[PDB]
C-alpha cells in the first residue's frame, strides 16, 4: 500500500473540490469570485506549500503581507487559474511518489516539473510523468520487490521522455538476472525458441526458430506451430 499525499494545502483542496464539481465557465468565475472577495474582505488566512507560481498563490501572498491586485476574472483567466492549481497539486503527487519510493531524485525530475515552459507544455509533461507510472504499474507484478529493477526502469523511462514525444512506438529494455525472474519462465512454454549456429564469422549463421504465432508481420497465411529459418551465402568480390 503506497502512501497517499494527504498534506494538502488550501489551493490543493480547492482543486480537489472544484475538479469533482465544476461543470461550466461560470462555475469558475463564481468560485474564484467568492475566494477573491473572501481574501479582500480578509476573512481567511490560508496556508500554501512554498514554491508555486500560480496566480492564486500570488494573490494569497498579496492578501497576507499587504493588499491584492484587481484580478478581473474575464477571458480565459478563470480556466488558467484552475489549471495552474491542478498542475502544482498533480506535480507534487508525482514527486512524492517517485522520491518517496526512491525511484528518482528531485534533480532527475526537473524537466517534467519545469515552471518556465508554457502551460500546454507543462500539461504535456505531466502526461509523460503519468505514462511513466503506467509503465511501472504494468511491470510491478513481474518485478515484485526488485527495487533496483523498479529504479532502473524509472531511470531509463525518464531518460527516454526528456528527449522524445509521448506518441512514439518504443520498446524499453530492462536487464534482469534470470534468478530474479525464474518463476516466470522456467516451467513455462516459450512463445519463441531460437537456436543460432555460427563460428567466429558471427555474421555467418544458420537460424532455426519455433513460435506460437507468426514471427513475420507481412506474411499472409490466407495447435499450429510456426517454424522459420535463416540461412545465408557468402559472396566474395
Amino acid at each position: 500500500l503506497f502512501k497517499v499525499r494527504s498534506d494538502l494545502d488550501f489551493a490543493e483542496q480547492l482543486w480537489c473540490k472544484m475538479s469533482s464539481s465544476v461543470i461550466s465557465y461560470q462555475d469558475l468565475v463564481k468560485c474564484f469570485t467568492l475566494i477573491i472577495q473572501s481574501l479582500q474582505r480578509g476573512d481567511i488566512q490560508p496556508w500554501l506549500h512554498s514554491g508555486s507560481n500560480s496566480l492564486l498563490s500570488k494573490l494569497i501572498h498579496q492578501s497576507y503581507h499587504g493588499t491584492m491586485d484587481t484580478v478581473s476574472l474575464s477571458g480565459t483567466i478563470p480556466v488558467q487559474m484552475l489549471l495552474e492549481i491542478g498542475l502544482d497539486k498533480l506535480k507534487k503527487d508525482y514527486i512524492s511518489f517517485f522520491i518517496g519510493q526512491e525511484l528518482a531524485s528531485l534533480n532527475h525530475l526537473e524537466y517534467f516539473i519545469a515552471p518556465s515552459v508554457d502551460i500546454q507544455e507543462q500539461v504535456y509533461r505531466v502526461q509523460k510523468l503519468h505514462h511513466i507510472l503506467e509503465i511501472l504499474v504494468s511491470c510491478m507484478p513481474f518485478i515484485k520487490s526488485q527495487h533496483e529493477l523498479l529504479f532502473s526502469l524509472t531511470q531509463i523511462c525518464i531518460k527516454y521522455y526528456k528527449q522524445n514525444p509521448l506518441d512514439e512506438q518504443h520498446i524499453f529494455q530492462l536487464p534482469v538476472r534470470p534468478t530474479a525472474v525464474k518463476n516466470l519462465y522456467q516451467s513455462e512454454k516459450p512463445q519463441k525458441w531460437r537456436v543460432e549456429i555460427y563460428s567466429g564469422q558471427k555474421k555467418i549463421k544458420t537460424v532455426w526458430q519455433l513460435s506460437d504465432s507468426s514471427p513475420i508481420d507481412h506474411l499472409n497465411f490466407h495447435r499450429i506451430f510456426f517454424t522459420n529459418m535463416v540461412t545465408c551465402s557468402q559472396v566474395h568480390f
Binding site: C16, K17, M18, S20, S21, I23, S24, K30, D43, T76, V79, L83, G86, K89, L90, I119, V123, E134, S138, C139, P141, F142, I143, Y160, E168, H170, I171, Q173, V176, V181, L184, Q186, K192, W193, R194, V195, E196, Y198, S199, I204, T206, Q209, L210, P215, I216, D217, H218, L219, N220, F225, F226, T227, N228, M229, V230, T231, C232, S233, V235, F237
Partner: protein, 265 residues
Amino acid sequence: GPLGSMWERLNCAAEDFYSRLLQKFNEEKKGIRKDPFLYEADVQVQLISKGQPNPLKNILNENDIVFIVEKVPGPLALPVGKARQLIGLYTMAHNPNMTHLKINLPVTALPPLWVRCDSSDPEGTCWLGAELITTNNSITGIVLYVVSCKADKNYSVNLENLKNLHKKRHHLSTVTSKGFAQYELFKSQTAIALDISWSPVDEILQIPPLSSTATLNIKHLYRELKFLLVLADGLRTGVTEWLEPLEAKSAVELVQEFLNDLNKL
C-alpha cells in the same frame, strides 16, 4: 525505371540507389525524416535506428541499424523476384569490380538492407537481406540472407542436422551456438515479454539456464488528470468537454462551504 532494361547500367540504377540510401544513413546520423522514401512509387524504404521497433527482432538476435524495404500500403510484401532485384542493386552498388559513372568517392558500407517478400516462391521466402563484410575500411563481400517461414500442425528439427547443415554449407570444422527464448508475460503501449539468451545450446527447446543473459521487453484515466486535460483542451480550442460532476453539492456550494469552515477559526 532503367532497371531491367539495357539502360540500367547506362543510367546508373544501382548508383542512384546507393546514393539515395547514403543520403539517409548520412541524414539519420542526425535528422529523423519520419518519411520512408518512395524509391519506386510502389516501393518504399525506411531506416531503423535508435531504439525503435525493429521488425528483424522477431527472427534475429542482432538489433542493428537497418533498412527495411516494402510495398507501399500491417506492412506489405513485394514479390520475391522484385526483392531479389533490389538486393541485386544494393550488392552491385557496393561491389569494387563494378564500373561507376556518377560516384567518384570510395563507397561506404551502408546499413544492411532487408526486403519483405510474399513467399509465392517454391521455397517460401519471406525476407531477403544483404550485409556487407568490411576488412578495415575496405569492403570485401556481402552476406545474402534468406528467411523462410512455415506454419503446420507438426514440426521436425534436429540440433545435429542444423549443426552439419551449417558446416557443409560454409565449409567449417567447428561451430558454436547461441540460444534465445521469449516469454509473453502480459498482453491486452501495453505489452511485456521476457527475452533470454545464453551460450551454448545443447538441446532443442532447452530451458534457458540461470546463467543466461536476460531482459524485460516493454512495448477512464483517473478523474483529476482527466479534468486537467479537459481544461487544457478547452483553453486551446475554446470547447471544454466538462465532466459529469461527482458531488451533489454544486461547485459554488462546495466552495462557500469550504470558505465557511475556514472562517470559523
